[PDB]
Structure 1
Amino acid sequence: GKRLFIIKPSGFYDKRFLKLLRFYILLTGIPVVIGITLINVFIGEAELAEIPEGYVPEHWEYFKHPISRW
């Protein structure tokens, strides 16, 4: 069907670089987002309460998110 050729520069290297970038960012992004939604669904975000009398808090007991506290 008169299938002609179009000369184009080799896109194998650019595609390989993009695949490597996406794989190497996803390899840690998937466990990080899985851990984030797991602590946000099971460990639980903290709650606001007033300071009790005679009991000082720790330096890490002033923040909301558990990751910030850790």
Structure 2
Amino acid sequence: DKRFLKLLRFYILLTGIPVAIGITLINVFIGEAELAEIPEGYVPEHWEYFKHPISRWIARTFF
């Protein structure tokens, strides 16, 4: 029983710690977009309608 719980928290933390550090480093050093009016005659990319950098990375790359 102990071994499994140890493995469970190792493999969850194996990517959990890097992702939490990565998300924190994105928020601190990149931060969220600013809401803005659409400049005249300008056509935004479909992924330029989202606030968080990870959200608009998902929209740009995958969706």
Q: TM-score normalised to the size of structure 1?
A: 0.79
Q: Which runs of 5+ in 2 are unaligned?
A: 58-63
Deviates more, 1:42-51 or 1:30-39: 42-51
After superposing on structure 2, the runs of 4+ consecutive aligned residues of structure 1 that deviate more than 3 Å are none
User: How many residues of Structure 1 are paired with residues of Structure 2 in the alignment?
Assistant: 57
Q: Which runs of 5+ in 1 are unaligned?
A: 1-13
The alignment's C-alpha RMSD in Å is 0.5
Structure 1 vs Structure 2: percent identity of aligned residues? 98
Q: Deviations over 1:22-49 (max 9, x none)?
A: 0010010000000000000001111000
Higher normalized helix content (fraction of residues): 2
Structure ID, larger Rg: 1
Q: Deviations over 1:7-32 (max 9, x none)?
A: xxxxxxx0000000000100100000
